[PDB]
PDB file of C-alpha atoms in Angstrom:
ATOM      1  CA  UNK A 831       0.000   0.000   0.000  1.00 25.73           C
ATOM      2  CA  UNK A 832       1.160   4.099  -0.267  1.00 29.77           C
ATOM      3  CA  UNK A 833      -1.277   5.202   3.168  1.00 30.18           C
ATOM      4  CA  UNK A 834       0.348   5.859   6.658  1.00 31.06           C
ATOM      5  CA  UNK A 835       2.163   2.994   8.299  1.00 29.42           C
ATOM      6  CA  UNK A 836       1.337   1.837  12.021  1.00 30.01           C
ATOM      7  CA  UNK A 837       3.206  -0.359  14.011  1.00 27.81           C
ATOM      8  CA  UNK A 838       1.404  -3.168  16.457  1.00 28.61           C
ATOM      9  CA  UNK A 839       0.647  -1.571  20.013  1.00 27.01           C
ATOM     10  CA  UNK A 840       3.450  -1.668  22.599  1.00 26.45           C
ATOM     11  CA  UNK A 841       5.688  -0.621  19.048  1.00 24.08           C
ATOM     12  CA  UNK A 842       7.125   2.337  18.202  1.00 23.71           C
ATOM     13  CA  UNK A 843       7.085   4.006  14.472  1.00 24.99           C
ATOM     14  CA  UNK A 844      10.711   5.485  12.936  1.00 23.86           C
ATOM     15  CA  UNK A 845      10.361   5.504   9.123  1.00 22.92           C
ATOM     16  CA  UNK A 846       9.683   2.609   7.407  1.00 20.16           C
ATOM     17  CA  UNK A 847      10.077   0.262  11.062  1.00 18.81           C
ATOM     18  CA  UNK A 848       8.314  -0.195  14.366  1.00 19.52           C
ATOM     19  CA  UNK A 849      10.763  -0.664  17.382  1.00 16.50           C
ATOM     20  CA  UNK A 850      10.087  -2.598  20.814  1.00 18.44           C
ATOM     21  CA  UNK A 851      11.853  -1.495  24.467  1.00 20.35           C
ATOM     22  CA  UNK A 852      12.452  -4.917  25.570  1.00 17.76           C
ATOM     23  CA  UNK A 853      13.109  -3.635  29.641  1.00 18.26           C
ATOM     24  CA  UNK A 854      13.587  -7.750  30.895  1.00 15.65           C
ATOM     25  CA  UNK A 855      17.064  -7.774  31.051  1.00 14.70           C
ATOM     26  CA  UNK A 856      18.416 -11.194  29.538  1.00 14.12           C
ATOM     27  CA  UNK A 857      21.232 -12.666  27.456  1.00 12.04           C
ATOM     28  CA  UNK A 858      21.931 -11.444  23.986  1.00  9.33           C
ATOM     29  CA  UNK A 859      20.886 -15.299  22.442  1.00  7.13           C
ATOM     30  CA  UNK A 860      17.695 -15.018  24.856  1.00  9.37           C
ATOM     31  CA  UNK A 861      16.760 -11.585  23.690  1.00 11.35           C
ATOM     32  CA  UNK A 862      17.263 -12.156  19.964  1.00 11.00           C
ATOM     33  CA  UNK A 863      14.788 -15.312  20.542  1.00  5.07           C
ATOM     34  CA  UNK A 864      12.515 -12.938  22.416  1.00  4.06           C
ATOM     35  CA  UNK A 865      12.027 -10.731  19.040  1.00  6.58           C
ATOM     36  CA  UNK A 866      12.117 -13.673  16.867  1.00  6.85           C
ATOM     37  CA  UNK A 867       9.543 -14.676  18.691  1.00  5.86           C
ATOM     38  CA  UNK A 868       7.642 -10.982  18.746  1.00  7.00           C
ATOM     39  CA  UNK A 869       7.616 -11.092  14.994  1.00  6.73           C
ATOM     40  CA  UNK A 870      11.324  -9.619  14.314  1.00  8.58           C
ATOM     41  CA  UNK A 871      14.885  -9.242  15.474  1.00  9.71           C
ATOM     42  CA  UNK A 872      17.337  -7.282  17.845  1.00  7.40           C
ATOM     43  CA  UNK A 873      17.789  -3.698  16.267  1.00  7.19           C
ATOM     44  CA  UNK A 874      20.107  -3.371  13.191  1.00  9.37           C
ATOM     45  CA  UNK A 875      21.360   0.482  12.591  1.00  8.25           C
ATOM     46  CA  UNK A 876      21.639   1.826   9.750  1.00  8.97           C
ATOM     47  CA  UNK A 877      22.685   5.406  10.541  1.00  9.07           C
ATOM     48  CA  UNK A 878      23.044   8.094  12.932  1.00  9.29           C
ATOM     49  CA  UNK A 879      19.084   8.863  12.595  1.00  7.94           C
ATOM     50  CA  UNK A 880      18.566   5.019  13.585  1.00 10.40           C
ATOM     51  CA  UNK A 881      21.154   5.125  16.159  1.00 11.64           C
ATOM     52  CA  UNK A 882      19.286   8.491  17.863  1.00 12.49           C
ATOM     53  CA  UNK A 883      16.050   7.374  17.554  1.00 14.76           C
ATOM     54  CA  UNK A 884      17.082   4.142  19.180  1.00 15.56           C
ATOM     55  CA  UNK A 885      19.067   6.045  21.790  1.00 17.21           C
ATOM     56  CA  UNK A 886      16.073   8.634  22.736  1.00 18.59           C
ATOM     57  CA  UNK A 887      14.243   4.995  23.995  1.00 18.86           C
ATOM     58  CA  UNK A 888      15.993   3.171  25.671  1.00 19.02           C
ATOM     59  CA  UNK A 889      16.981   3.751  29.046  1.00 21.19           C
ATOM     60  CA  UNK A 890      20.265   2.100  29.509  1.00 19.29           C
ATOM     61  CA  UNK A 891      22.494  -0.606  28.026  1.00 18.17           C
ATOM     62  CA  UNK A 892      20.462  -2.420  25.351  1.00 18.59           C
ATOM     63  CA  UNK A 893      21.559  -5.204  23.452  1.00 15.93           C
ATOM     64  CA  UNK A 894      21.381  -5.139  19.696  1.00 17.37           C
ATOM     65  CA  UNK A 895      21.352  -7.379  16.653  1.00 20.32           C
ATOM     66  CA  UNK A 896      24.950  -7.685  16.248  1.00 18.28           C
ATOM     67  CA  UNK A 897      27.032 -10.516  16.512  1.00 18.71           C
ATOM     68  CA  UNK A 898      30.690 -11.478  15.680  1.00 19.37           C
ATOM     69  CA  UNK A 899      30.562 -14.707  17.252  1.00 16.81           C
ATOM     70  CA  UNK A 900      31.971 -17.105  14.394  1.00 16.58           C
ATOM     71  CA  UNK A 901      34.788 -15.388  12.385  1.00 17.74           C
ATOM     72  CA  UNK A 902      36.510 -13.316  14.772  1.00 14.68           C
ATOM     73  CA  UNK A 903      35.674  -9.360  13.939  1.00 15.37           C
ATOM     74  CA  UNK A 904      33.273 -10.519  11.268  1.00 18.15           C
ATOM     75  CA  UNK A 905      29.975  -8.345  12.222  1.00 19.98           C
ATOM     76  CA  UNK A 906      26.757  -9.385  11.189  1.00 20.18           C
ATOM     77  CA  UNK A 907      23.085  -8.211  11.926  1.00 19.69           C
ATOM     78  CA  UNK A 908      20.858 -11.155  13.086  1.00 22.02           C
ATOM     79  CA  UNK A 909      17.917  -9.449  10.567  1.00 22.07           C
ATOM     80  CA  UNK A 910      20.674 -10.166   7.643  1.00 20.29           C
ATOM     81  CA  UNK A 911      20.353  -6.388   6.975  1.00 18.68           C
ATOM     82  CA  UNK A 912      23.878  -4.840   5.638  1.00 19.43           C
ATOM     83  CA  UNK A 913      26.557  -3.613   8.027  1.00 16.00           C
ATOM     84  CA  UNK A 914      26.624  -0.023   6.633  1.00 16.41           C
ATOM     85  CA  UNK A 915      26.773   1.853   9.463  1.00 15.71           C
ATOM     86  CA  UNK A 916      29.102   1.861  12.500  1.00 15.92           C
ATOM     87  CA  UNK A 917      29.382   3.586  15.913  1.00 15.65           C
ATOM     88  CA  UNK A 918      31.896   1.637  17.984  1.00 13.91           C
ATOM     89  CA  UNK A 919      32.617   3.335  21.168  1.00 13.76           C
ATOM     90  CA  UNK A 920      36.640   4.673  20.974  1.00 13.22           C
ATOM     91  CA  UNK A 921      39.109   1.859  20.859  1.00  9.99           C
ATOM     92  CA  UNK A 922      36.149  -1.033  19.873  1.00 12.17           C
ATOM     93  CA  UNK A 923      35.607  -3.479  19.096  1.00 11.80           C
ATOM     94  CA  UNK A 924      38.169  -5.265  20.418  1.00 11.17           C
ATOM     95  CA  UNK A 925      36.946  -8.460  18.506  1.00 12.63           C
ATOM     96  CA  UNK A 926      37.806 -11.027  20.986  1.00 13.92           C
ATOM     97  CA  UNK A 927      35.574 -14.223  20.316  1.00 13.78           C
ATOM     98  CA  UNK A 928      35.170 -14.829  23.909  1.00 11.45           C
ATOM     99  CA  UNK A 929      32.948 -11.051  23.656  1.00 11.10           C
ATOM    100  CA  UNK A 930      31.390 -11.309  20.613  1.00 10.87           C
ATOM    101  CA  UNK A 931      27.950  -9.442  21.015  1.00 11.67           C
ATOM    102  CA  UNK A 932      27.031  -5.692  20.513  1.00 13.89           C
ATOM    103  CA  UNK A 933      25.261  -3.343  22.653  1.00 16.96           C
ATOM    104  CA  UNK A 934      24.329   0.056  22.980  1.00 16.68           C
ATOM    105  CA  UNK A 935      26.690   1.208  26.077  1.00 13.47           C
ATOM    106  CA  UNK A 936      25.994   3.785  29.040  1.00 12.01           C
ATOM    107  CA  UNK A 937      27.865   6.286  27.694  1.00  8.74           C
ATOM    108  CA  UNK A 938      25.133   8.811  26.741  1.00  9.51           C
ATOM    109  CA  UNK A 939      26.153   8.725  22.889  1.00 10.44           C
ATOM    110  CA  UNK A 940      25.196   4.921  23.369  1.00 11.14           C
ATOM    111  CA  UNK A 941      28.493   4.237  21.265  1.00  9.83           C
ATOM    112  CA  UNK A 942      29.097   0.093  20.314  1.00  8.88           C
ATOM    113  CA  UNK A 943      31.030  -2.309  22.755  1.00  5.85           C
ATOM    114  CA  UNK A 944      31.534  -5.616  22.083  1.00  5.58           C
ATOM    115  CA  UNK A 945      30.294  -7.703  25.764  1.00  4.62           C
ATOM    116  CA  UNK A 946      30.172 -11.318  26.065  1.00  5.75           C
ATOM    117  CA  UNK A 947      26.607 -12.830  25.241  1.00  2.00           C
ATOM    118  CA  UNK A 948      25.698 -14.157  28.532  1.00  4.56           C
ATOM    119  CA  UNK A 949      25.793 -10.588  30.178  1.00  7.78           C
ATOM    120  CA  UNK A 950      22.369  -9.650  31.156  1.00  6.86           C
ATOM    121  CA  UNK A 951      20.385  -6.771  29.378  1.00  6.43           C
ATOM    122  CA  UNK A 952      17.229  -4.947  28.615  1.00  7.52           C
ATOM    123  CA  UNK A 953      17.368  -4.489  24.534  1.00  6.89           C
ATOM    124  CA  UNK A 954      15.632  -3.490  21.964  1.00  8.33           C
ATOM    125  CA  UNK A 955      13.942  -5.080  18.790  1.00  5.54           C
ATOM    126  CA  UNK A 956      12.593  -3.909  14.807  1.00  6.25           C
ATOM    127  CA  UNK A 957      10.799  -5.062  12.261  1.00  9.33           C
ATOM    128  CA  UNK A 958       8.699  -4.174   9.632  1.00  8.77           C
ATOM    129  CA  UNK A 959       5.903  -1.450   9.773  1.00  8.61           C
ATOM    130  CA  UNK A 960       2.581  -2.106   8.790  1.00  9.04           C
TER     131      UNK A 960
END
């Protein structure tokens, strides 16, 4: 269709996506199966628009859809979207396998780190608007 998008209630509109404020903190594998299972993914960014709107939600540390888990350094976004976009906070990541999922740190900028997946933390997923 070409009329006004919505997104599902508890969702949040930014352009063509809806975005959900997961606040359960949990692992990074547990909170990408939480999305999968609420119809999408963890957030992929795709600019500095994405990355403000995403930081004027969320209210901490959030996990996102980024993973480097089987090549070492080798980013990916669990929604298979392109990695075209980058905000590492200064020095990351330090692509260690051992820490090889991406959040959204407490630094107010909510630059990139790279935090082993078993840390616990609230995150945030996307998908398609309707």
């Amino acid at each position: 269709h070409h009329h006004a998008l919505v997104c599902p209630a508890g969702w949040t509109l930014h352009g063509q996506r809806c975005f959900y404020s997961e606040a359960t903190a949990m692992t990074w594998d547990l909170a990408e199966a939480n999305c999968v299972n609420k119809g999408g993914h963890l957030a992929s960014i795709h600019s500095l628009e994405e990355q403000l709107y995403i930081k004027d939600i969320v209210a901490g540390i959030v996990w996102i859809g980024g993973s480097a888990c089987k090549v070492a350094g080798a980013w990916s976004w669990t929604d298979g979207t392109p990695v075209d976009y980058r905000t590492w906070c200064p020095t990351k990541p330090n692509d260690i396998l051992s820490d090889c999922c991406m959040q959204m740190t407490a630094a107010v900028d909510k630059c990139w780190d790279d935090l082993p997946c078993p840390a616990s933390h609230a995150s945030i997923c996307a998908k398609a608007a309707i």
